[PDB]
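Recap quiz, item 2
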Amino acid sequence: RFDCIGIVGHPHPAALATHEILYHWLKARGYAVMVEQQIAHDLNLTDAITGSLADIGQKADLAVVVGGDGNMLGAARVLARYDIKVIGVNRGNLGFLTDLDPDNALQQLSDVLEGEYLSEQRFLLETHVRSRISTAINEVVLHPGKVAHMIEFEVYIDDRFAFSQRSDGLIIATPTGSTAYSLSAGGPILTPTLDAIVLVPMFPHTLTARPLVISSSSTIRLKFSHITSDLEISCDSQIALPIQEGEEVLIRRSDFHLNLIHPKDYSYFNTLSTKLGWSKKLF
Amino acid sequence: RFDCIGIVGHPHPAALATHEILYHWLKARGYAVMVEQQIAHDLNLTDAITGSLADIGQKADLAVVVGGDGNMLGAARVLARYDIKVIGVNRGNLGFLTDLDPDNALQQLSDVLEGEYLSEQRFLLETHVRSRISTAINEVVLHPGKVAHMIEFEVYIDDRFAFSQRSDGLIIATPTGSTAYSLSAGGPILTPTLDAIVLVPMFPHTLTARPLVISSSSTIRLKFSHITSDLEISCDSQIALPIQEGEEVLIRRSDFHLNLIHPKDYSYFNTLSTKLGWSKKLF
């Protein structure tokens, strides 16, 4: 059972009803509820217990993230610092982190609160530049400032030299990231709980480049020759950290884990197929 | 240390010198040697202790597989049934299972016998059709008899329906297989010790198909609609097992493990780069 439920998200104005309905529903069912500060203000919830995201993350037992997969992205990176259960309500179709359909959210959530849920752990990525420490649920991306600019770098795996590369950047994706930016760059789908990390080059210079899937207990090091162009590292499409001259990037499995939960009737492959347009049962 | 070394392989006639040199060298260094029956005959080794591959596999402590990666393929599938160390001498360049270069084989092997080796385990695939039980080091491939013939099937992962497919077949590859047939079908490279298995469709009917990387502790089930065309399963390009009507294919991690060893100066990424034509150290 969950004593304290938190409502997270940042609502255009018609997404507000969802927050409003959920807050009253959760409340009338006897739960203590923490809403995010912005939503309390937006809905004028004078009685509501509010808090920042970190607050909810420390004091709530479950966070219902309302919104899309992108909303979930910033929310998840924080809530993963904590031992809180996270579940999401999407808007319309299923997403890879949001599996409560709005048409049936309450009913499904009602069963989840009863304790009918599938609990799993998504791992995050950690990045140092050398120390700035940033994290990512989907991917870390190395890339220059100019769009079509070829860079050179060497890739070390577990302290040992793996390979050089001439290209426009490298994408490093978690299983959760594999269906994201990495997919659109020609990378493979990894199953969500897999202990793996995929490296996908962007516009490689040689024709023999291919997505490399490595163990998630592996360490990655980026070394660079010289800097007259601006190297940058992005984590989940948040603000690029500049990479200075003589600096290296260190990417590894983070110690923070997203404690996702799902309703019993959830399955990954069904989410995947509906998302990608795969064939359903044929006979 | 290794008491009993076995020489395995099937030698065109100039590959015979290698077998001949190795057998005398191993012998003069004090080892008990088991040669394969064919090679004993081919070299006229009247004193040699011989045996089938299974024999060497049960009685030798190390098998030196002379030849190419293809020679290693049949040899490995058998030697993996046993707790024997396996190392290979290639012919020319490095391969993914053969890392002793002929130009330096003895010297490197001499250090290996001293106990200077990196030991690792490649897992195999197991297939039932329902029961015929066959195994594979590289991949299992579902495909019809006619070359360009579209088939329909459903794929179950861990007893649950994953997705349907219309295509010309499915490749299911181990990490060791990932650099093989699967690669040429547009699949990704998996790192050799990774607990993963990759599914790669062949000529899919829908544009949204993509290599799927799943956990190696996962089970796979192929179900089919009807049979007027001849379905077949191939394991490591050996003779196709026919798949009758009402029959399903079951593919899972086999319990047999290839106990490969490597010399200290071996590294996967160096083998990979030389094989694929990747850039070496740039600075």
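The helical segments of chain A are 16-28, 37-43, 53-59, 69-79, 105-114, 181-184, 268-276.
Chain A touches chain B through 46 residues (CB under 8 Å).
End of item.
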